[PDB]
Amino acid sequence: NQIDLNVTCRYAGVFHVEKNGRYSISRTEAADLCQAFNSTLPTMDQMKLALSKGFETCRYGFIEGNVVIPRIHPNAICAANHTGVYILVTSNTSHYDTYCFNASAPPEEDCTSVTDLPNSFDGPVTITIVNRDGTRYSKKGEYRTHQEDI
Numbered sequence: 057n058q059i060d061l062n063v064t065c066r067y068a069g070v071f072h073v074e075k076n077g078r079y080s081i082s083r084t085e086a087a088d089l090c091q092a093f094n095s096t097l098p099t100m101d102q103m104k105l106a107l108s109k110g111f112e113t114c115r116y117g118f119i120e121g122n123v124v125i126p127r128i129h130p131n132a133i134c135a136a137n138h139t140g141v142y143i144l145v146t147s148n149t150s151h152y153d154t155y156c157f158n159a160s161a162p163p164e165e166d167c168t169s170v171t172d173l174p175n176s177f178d179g180p181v182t183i184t185i186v187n188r189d190g191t192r193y194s195k196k197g198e199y200r201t202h203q204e205d206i
């Protein structure tokens with residue numbers, strides 16, 4: 057009973073979380089997941105500030121109200137070569153990665169690793185935070201509050 061959460065640098069508190077190496081998070085799960093990091097789904101303004109500090113990914117993820125990809129450098133296979141906060145307009149499907157926002161993080165680029173999941177609750181899952189540098193933090197718990205996400 058294991059969940060891997062690949063996390064990134066935080067940029068103005070915003071970071072990306074990919075679950076189990078595939079697009080697999082629902083919007084309800086995403087809010088609960090960010091809450092386990094003492095975080096919330098970023099607003100579009102929080103995400104735009106994170107973008108301005110150096111944040112970009114090549115994955116769709118929830119923010120408050122939309123599913124987006126922050127892009128700095130045009131890349132043909134990432135958000136169709138767009139720059140800025142690219143908003144997904146048309147999709148059949150509901151599961152993506154998520155972005156999270158931690159107001160207590162540093163104001164600009166924080167590329168230290170994540171070494172805790174401070175607000176997860178008691179549960180049976182071995183949850184492993186995987187950093188981009190491969191360092192890991194694991195803890196037994198749960199973060200999902202909606203049965204349909206389990």
Ligand SMILES: CC(=O)Nc1ccccc1O
Pocket residue numbers: 066071093158160161162170171172173174
């Ligand atoms: C203060 C701070 O940097 N908190 C935080 C941010 C992202 C993931 C886990 C964390 O504990």
